[model samples]
Target: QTTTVYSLEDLLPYLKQDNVDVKLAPGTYNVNGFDVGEDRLFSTTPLFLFEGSNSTYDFTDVKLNINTVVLTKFGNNEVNEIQILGNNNVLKNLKLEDIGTTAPSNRAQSIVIDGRDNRIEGFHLTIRGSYPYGYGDAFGKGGGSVINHRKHSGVLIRGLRNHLKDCTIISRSYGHIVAMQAASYPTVEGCYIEGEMRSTDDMLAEEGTGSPADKVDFMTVWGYKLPAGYMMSLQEGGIRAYNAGTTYIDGVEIQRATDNPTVLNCTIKNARTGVTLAHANGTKYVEGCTVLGCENGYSIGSGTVVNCGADAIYGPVFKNTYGSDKGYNADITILPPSDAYYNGHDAVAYIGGSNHNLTFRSEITEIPSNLKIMVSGDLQGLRVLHGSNPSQNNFAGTNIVLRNLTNFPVDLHSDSSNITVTSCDTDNITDNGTNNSIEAIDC
Candidate 1:
C-alpha cells in the first residue's frame, strides 16, 4: 500500500513499518526540534530515524531543511539529521540541507546508514557547520591539532551490503564526504562529491595576529611550522574506508573491520583523497572513477583499479599507502589538470608494493617539468616536514612491472629491486636501483 503524508509528524509512524511504501507530499519541511533519547556510542539524536525493514520511501521533490540550533539543544553530543537502522530499505530523491553555518559542539553528520542491504539513491546533500574550517588539516584534525576542531561529516555508511547510488554531496565544512566504517561489500556508484580547496601559501600570508596559524606560532598539525606553496583541501575525503570501528546493532555493541568495499563511476573534486581503500581488508575494487584537483587521487592496498582517471594538480594520481601491500593491479590514465599545478609533491605517482602491475597512459602534451614517477624513493615535496622518516617509502624486496605510455620520466630508488619497464615513450629513466630492466621503445 502507498501512503502519502503531508508533514514530518505524519511520516514518523510509517518509518517503522515493514514492506510498505511511503511518500511525502511535495513540499518543504523545516526541522527545528528533536527528541532527546538514549545516548548512542556511534551517533546522537536523529531528526528522522528510519527503523523499518524492507520499506521504500519515495521522497521525490521533498526538501528537508534542518536548523543548526538543534545541534546543541540536545546536550553536548554528535547529532545526525537522518539515520537508518533497518535492512533492505530504499530512501530516494530527498533534498536535504542544513540551515545556518554555526559549528556544532561536537561531531555531527548529515546522514548515517547502519543497516544491511539498504540503499539511499538520488539524494542531494548540502553539508555545513564545522569549526576551524578553510585550513583543512593544517591546524589539526584530532588530538594533534593545534586548534580544537569540530567536525560535520556528510554521510556515514556501515553494515553489510549497504549502498549509496547517484547521490550528490556538496561538503562546505570539515570531515569526510562519504565514509565507510566496519562495512562489508559496501558500494558507492555514480556519485558526485565536491569540496573546497585552499593554498597553503595563502594560509601563510594571513595576518599574523588573529589567524589560527598565528595563535599557535604558525605550527601545523604535522608538528612543524606551516609551509607554503601547497594546495590543501578544506575537507578531508571524498570516498574513504576505514579498517575498524564500533557500532551498536540490536542492543549489542559490535566491533569489526571493513571488507570488500567497491566504488564505481564516481566523480570527486577538491578533497584530500578521492578514493582511499588502502585501510580496508578484502577485495577492494574501483572502476571508472574520475578524480580532479584532489591532494591525492587513489590509494589501494591490494586490489584492482580498472579504467580510472585522475589529475596531478596538487599531488600524485596514484599512491601506495604502505610498503607491505602486494598484488595490486591498476590501469589509470593521467588527465590534464583544470587548474594551475600546485603539485607540492613534484611527483606524479609514488608506488611501493610487490608483484604489482601498473599501466599508465597520458595524452596530455605538456607535463610538469618536475613531475616524475617515483618508485620507492624519498619524495621531495614541500609537505615532508622535519624529523619525518624517509624509510616509509622503502621498497626493499619489492618487484613490479610498469607499462609506461607517457612522456614522463621514471625514477627507480635504491631500495627497489627487480623492476621491469616496457614500451616507454620517454628515455629519461634514472636507474638508482639494482636488478632493473628498461626496454625503451618508440611509440
Candidate 2:
C-alpha cells in the first residue's frame, strides 16, 4: 500500500504503520522544532524511523532542513539528523540540510544507518558546523580545549551490508563527509564530497602560530611558525574509517568490525584525505577514485588501491605513515610528476615504521625535475616498477627490489640492507649500505 504525506503531521501515522509505501508531497519540512534532546550516540532521536520491514519511502521533489545552534558542553555527545533502523528498507531521492554548528567533538551526524541490508541512494546532503581552527587556539590544543572545535560527519554507516550510493555530501563545517567506523561490508560508491580548507600558510597567518605536536602531521604546523616541514590538511577529510572495536545497539552489543569497506568512483575535493583506512587489520579496497586538494590523498595502512590517483594540486599526492601490519599494494598513477617549481613534489613518501610486501608501480616516460621516491625506516619486501627517470630514488629502508628502472641518482643510505637492483640503465649509483646487489641487464 502507498500513502501520500502532505505535511509533517501527516507523516507520523504512516511511520507507525507496517507494509506501506510513502510518497512525500512536494513541500518543505521544517524539522527544527522536533528536538528530542541529545541522542547523538544511540541516534534514538531521529526525524523519521522506518520501523516497519520491507518498506519504501520516496521523497521526490521534497526538502528536509535541520535548524542549528552553538552547543557548548564538553561531554555533550548527542544530536543527529536521520536514522534508518529497519531491515530491507529503501530511502531515496531527497535532500537533507543541517543549518547549525555543532562543536567538532560533538559526534553529531546527518544520517545514521543501523539496520541490515538497507539502501540509501540518489540523495543530497548539506552538512554544516565544524570548527576549523587555525594554527593555535583550540584547534590543535590537547586535552579539554580540543572539544570546542570537534564536529560530526555527513553519514555514519553501521550494521551489516548497508550501502550509500550516488550521493553528494557537502561539509560546511569540520568532520569527515562519510565514515564507516562500526560496520561490516559497508560500501560508498559514486559520491561527490567537498570541504572548505585553506592552504597551510593561510591557516598559520590567521591563527598566530604556536607550538603544536611535533611527531603527528595532521593537525600541526611543526615549528611554531610559517614554512614548516608539513602542514596538516582539513582536520578531518572526505572519508575516514577506523577499527571501532564494538558498538552497542538496542541493548545488544553489535560486534563492530571496521573492515572490508569498498569505495568506488568517488570524486573528493578540498577535503583532508580522499580515502583513509586508519589502523584497520582486514583488507580494504578503493578503486577508480579521484582525491584533489587535501593533505594526504590516499592514507592506507593495509589494503589494495587500484587505478586510483593523488595530485599535489591539493597537498601531498601519496603518504603512508604505517609500519608492521604491511600488505600495502598499489597500481596507481600520479599526475604532473613532482616539480618543486610547479605543483610541489609528486613524491611517494614512506616515512617511519615497519613495512613488508609494499609494491608500487608507475609507468611514465619521464619523471619531471625534483620528482622523487623517498623512504625512511624498517621497510622490507619492497618492489618498484618505474618507466621514467626521477630526480632521485633515495632508499632509506631494508630488503628492497627495483626492477625495470631508469634513474638519475639511486642513493642508498647507511641503514639500507639487502637491496636488489635489476634491469637498470642508470647514470650514477651511490651505495652506503651492507649486503646489497646491483645487476644491470642492458645498455
Candidate 3:
C-alpha cells in the first residue's frame, strides 16, 4: 500500500464548506503542516477539526508530521487534537509547540485519546517547554495530560496493552502535567520529565518547581490504575495519585508532596525545602527507592514505606538517622558520589528517619566547607547547600567549585553509597575521633 498525505483542503474540503469524511486505507498519513503568514500559525497548528464523531483514521507504520502550532493554553482547542482512532498506530517524533521553547501549546492536552479498544504502539510525543523560567501563554503544562483515559475500559492507548517507552514530557504546568487519570488499568511506563531548577522565590518558572511541601490539593488519583515510571525534577511531586485504586509503582521515581507513593525500585531527589505529602494517604511501600536531596527524603507525612532498602529514606531530623535494618546502601543522602557539586546533606533541616525495614548502604559526604554561602534577609551570612537561599541578595558563584569535577571523574561505584567526594574519601565522623566528655556528634 502506498503512503497517503492529506491536507485541510483535501480532507476538510467543502466543510471548509461542508464537513465531510475522508477514508484512509492502512498505510500512513503525513498530516498537513502549519504555515506561518497563512494561518497566523502558532508553531503547533493542529489538523484543524470542525465537528465529526466516528472517524476511523489509522496510521499503521506511518509517520504523522505536525508543525507550526498557534499555542493556546485555554481556548484555541489546542488541547483537543484532531480526534483519531486506529490499529497499530506508530507515531514517531511528533513535535508539539516550538522547539527549544516552553509554551502552553494547548489548554488540556495535545493528544487526547478517547478511543475505545485501539492498537497504539511504539509512539513518541515530544514537547519542549518553549518558555524558560515562565509558562507560555499558548498552553498550560504537561502538554495538558497526554492520555486522559477516564471511565473508559479496555481502551488501551496501545493495542498490545504495551506502552510508549523512552518518551519525554517537559512541561511547566502545576497540575495534570503528564497524566493518566480518572480511569482504570492504563499505564505510563518508562517515561521521563526533564526541566530546569527553580528557586523557591521563583515560582512562575518551571512546571514542578513552584510546588512545595505540605501544600494540600497538590495531587489526585483514582480507582486501580498505576502510571508507572521515572518522573524527576529539582522541585518536587514526582507522582501524585489522589484517590487511585489498587495500583503499583514498580520501577519508578517520584518527588515532593506526591513523592509518598508505593515505590518499588526508584529514585526521588532534589526536594530541599521538604515534601508536602500534599494528600498522599496510607502505608506505601518504597523499596529499593532513592529518597534524597529533599529536606527529608522519606517524607512520610500522609504515607509510610514498607520493607525498603537501607539509607533509602533520609530525614535530616532522623537521629543517628534511624537504626539500620537490612538490605543495601549506607547513608540516606544518596547524592552521586562523583558530583561533589551538592556540597553535602543538610541532615536535620531535611530527611526523615529509617522505617527499620531494609539495610542498604549509602555513604554520603557532607563537605561542610563547600556549603554554598548566600546573603539572606534574616541572616547576613547563610551557608546553604544545593539550592540558593531565597532571602539572599548575592549569588557570588555556582560554576566555581564544581568546575574541576565536571567531566573527568574517577570511577562509578555501583553501591547505593556511590556518592563519594574527591576532596574526601572516608566517612570522617564515624571513622575519626574517640569517646570524649562531649562526642563529635554533640555539635
Give all TM-scores, in the order shown. Answer: 0.94, 0.75, 0.40
lDDT of 2 by residue, 259-376 (tens): 6788899988767678887544466888898776655677666677778766554344555544343445554555443323232333444432233333334445465544444444
Q: What are the runs in model 1 whose C-alpha is more than 4 Å off?
A: 33-44, 249-251, 381-384, 387-397
- Could you say which candidate leads in TM-score? 1
RMSD of each: 2.8, 7.1, 14.7
Give the Cα error of residue 303 in candidate 1, in Å. Answer: 0.4
Tens digits of lDDT, candidate 3, 112-222: 332223222334443332222221111112334223211101111211122333344443332232333222223343344332233222322323544322121222121
lDDT of 1 at 359: 89
Worst 10 residues of 2 by lDDT: 380-389
lDDT agreement with native, every candidate:
0.84, 0.59, 0.28
Candidate 2 has an lDDT of 0.59
At residue 288, give the lDDT of candidate 2: 90
Off by over 4 Å in 3: 1-69, 73-97, 100-108, 113-124, 129-132, 135-162, 171-177, 200-239, 242-360, 363-443
Q: Alpha-carbon error at 394 in model 1, in Å?
A: 4.6
Question: What lDDT is obtained when candidate 1 is compared to the true structure?
Answer: 0.84
**What ranking emerges by TM-score with the best candidate at the front?**
1, 2, 3
lDDT of 2 at 18: 58
Candidate 1 least-lDDT 10 residues: 35-44
